[PDB]
Amino acid sequence: GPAAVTVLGLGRMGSALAAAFLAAGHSTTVWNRTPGKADELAARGARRAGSVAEAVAAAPLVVVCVADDEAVHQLLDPLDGALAGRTLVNLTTGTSAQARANAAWAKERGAAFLDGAIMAVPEDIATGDAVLLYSGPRDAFDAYEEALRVLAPAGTTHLGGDAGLAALHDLALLGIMWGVLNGFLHGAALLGTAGVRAGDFAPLAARMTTVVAGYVTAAAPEVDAGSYPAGDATLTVHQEAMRHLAEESEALGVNAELPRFLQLLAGRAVAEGHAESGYSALVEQFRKA
Amino acid sequence: GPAAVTVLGLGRMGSALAAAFLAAGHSTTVWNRTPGKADELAARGARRAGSVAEAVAAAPLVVVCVADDEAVHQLLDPLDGALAGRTLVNLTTGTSAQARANAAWAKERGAAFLDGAIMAVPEDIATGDAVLLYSGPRDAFDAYEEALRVLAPAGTTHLGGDAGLAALHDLALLGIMWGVLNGFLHGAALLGTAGVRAGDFAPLAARMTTVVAGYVTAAAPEVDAGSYPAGDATLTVHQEAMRHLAEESEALGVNAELPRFLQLLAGRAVAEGHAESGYSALVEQFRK
């Protein structure tokens, strides 16, 4: 039946992971450095382990979700032989270098290793909206996919064998998130000068964000072909509208560094021959240090 | 019955507007500087106006959609009494300054004036994905709402009476577009170093964009309350992740100016006391 699992880390996210495993019928053993965080899970059927060593011994699948890579090694480095024969899944946030170093670290302890990235807030764990990304040996992912999938039943993806891939994808997706939020917050500042509450702008901003998701899909073949048709706006047209957004900002006393930076990316592409190309031509300067 | 309408300007957008009006059964009069653009519309029942003056006289509702405000005034400035008593709807992209000037210019000519912003590509006109935003006198929007709605049946919004409001919304929403596309293109450059095709990344990138749209909805009450709970990520955590994105860009030989700029903005909020606040606190530095 369902694999036994251990979750190390009972912060907001780790607690959500443990609850999802337990709700799906998995034997779920939990442990946390700060005390008093396991009482509700234990009441629902989780096992509160007496130590990190006991917790790791409880299951073949060991899921870690703590503050950072330093915290991971604070828990696991003292172990001696505990991880041999197990599969370690690190859903802690970190870098690609930390992920690759962890794969080698785990291999020396006789453990399989998958790095993961949680592309979700805790309340979206175990919903159709959650996305969790994994990288490392495919055999370990395939063996535990059915257990891992409870965390993101419609969004569990193995990216490939290089253990650093999940962290790279995590940072790239965060880049999109920050692009959205900066655009929303700068626009909320701009429209707020005209008496528009952020709650009245947000439905338009969320709708437009969903529309632009489709523009991302349209852009991908252009990037892959290296061919950048203007569509309905050359980069000259984009550049002029960006200048307009900077002018609106400056006239209202709103910070204009973001629209000027956007205008600079476009202006550079224009100076390098893309005045008549579509927006996807901006990938060319993103590729060059 | 349906209002008679005139469309001035038959580029890709303007042609799509006129096509939608005509398919909905409006008397549709069209004019373009290049007459051939009207051929297919006229064959389907649109009236090819012989001149701008004839076009404007044909209908009480005059929709303009040309390259920029300079082009708008090249068409309309020569008119003499033509626009009196009519309602002019300017769907050309422009600035709030241009919109304020146009409201005055139209009133001097006895015309009601709505500024509009088309938040759609031409092929999405008249679909449920189209968004079109208007500002100007509410009574003029009311008088022609049913006609205007054919351009965006599930997306037509009057924003308010302030002459420049549609232009401000247009450019703010374009800001979101550019930030998203930059994130996608930079992420595609980054992941391309590891063998990831943009077409492989795009399903994830698009899905995550749709998720973040929900984060926008959640952020708005924080902005309006001036209270920025950390949620699951303080600005300290965000700034560190952006530093990691920049460092990874540098180590892989892709451009790091975008993540460095993101870091800079977050660091400014941190230095103003928001180390432990959530991302919405960034609104305060956008206000100065």
Taking the CA atoms of A194, A195, A196 and A197 in sequence, report the sign of the dihedral they define: positive
**Which H or E element spans position B30?**
strand B28-31
* Cβ <8 Å between B172 and A192: no
Both structure tokens of A30: 């939990």
Q: Scanning every residue of chain B, which has its alpha carbon at the shortest distance from the alpha carbon of A200?
A: B220
User: Which string of DSSP letters, residue by residue, matches B53-72?
Assistant: HHHHHH-SEEEE--SSHHHH
Residues 26-85 of A with CB under 8 A from B: none
Q: Which residues in A lie closer than 8 A to residue B250 (C-beta atoms)?
A: 289
Distance between A252 CA and the closest CA of chain B, angstroms = 9
Single-letter amino acid code for the residue at A2? P
Q: Name the β-bridge partners of A180.
A: none
- Closest among A52, A44, A51, A56 to A18, alpha carbons compared: A44
Q: Name the β-bridge partners of B61.
A: B5, B87
Residue count (chain B) = 288
Within a 10 A sphere around the Cβ of B23, how many other Cβ atoms? 13
- Block residue for tokens 């006129």: B18
SS (H, E, C) B148-208: HHCCCCCCEEEEECCCCHHHHHHHHHHHHHHHHHHHHHHHHHHHHCCCCCHHHHHHHHHHH
DSSP state of A117: E
d(CA A85, CA A51): 19
Q: Which residues in B lie closer than 8 A to residue A165 (C-beta atoms)?
A: 194
* Structure determined via: X-ray
d(CA B239, CA A96): 17
Cα Rg of chain B, angstroms: 23
**Which H or E element spans position A135?**
strand A131-135
Q: Scanning every residue of chain B, which has its alpha carbon at the shortest distance from the alpha carbon of A133?
A: B204
- Closest among B87, B135, B93, B134 to B107, alpha carbons compared: B87
Residues 106-165 of B with CB under 8 A from A: 119-122, 129, 131, 133, 155, 157, 162, 164-165
Q: Which residues in A lie closer than 8 A to residue B167 (C-beta atoms)?
A: 248
- Closest among B162, B259, B12 to A286, alpha carbons compared: B259
Residue count (chain A) = 289
CA distances (Å), origin B150, targets A152, A257, B13, B26, B123? 40, 38, 14, 10, 14
Both structure tokens of A247: 């002018």
Distance between B13 CA and the closest CA of chain A, angstroms = 8
d(CA B101, CA B230): 43
Single-letter amino acid code for the residue at A177? M
* CB-count burial class (<10 Å; 0-12, 13-18, 19+) for A168: buried
Alpha-helical regions (H) of chain B? 12-23, 39-43, 52-58, 69-76, 96-108, 138-149, 165-192, 198-225, 235-252, 257-269, 282-286
* Cβ <8 Å between B175 and A245: yes
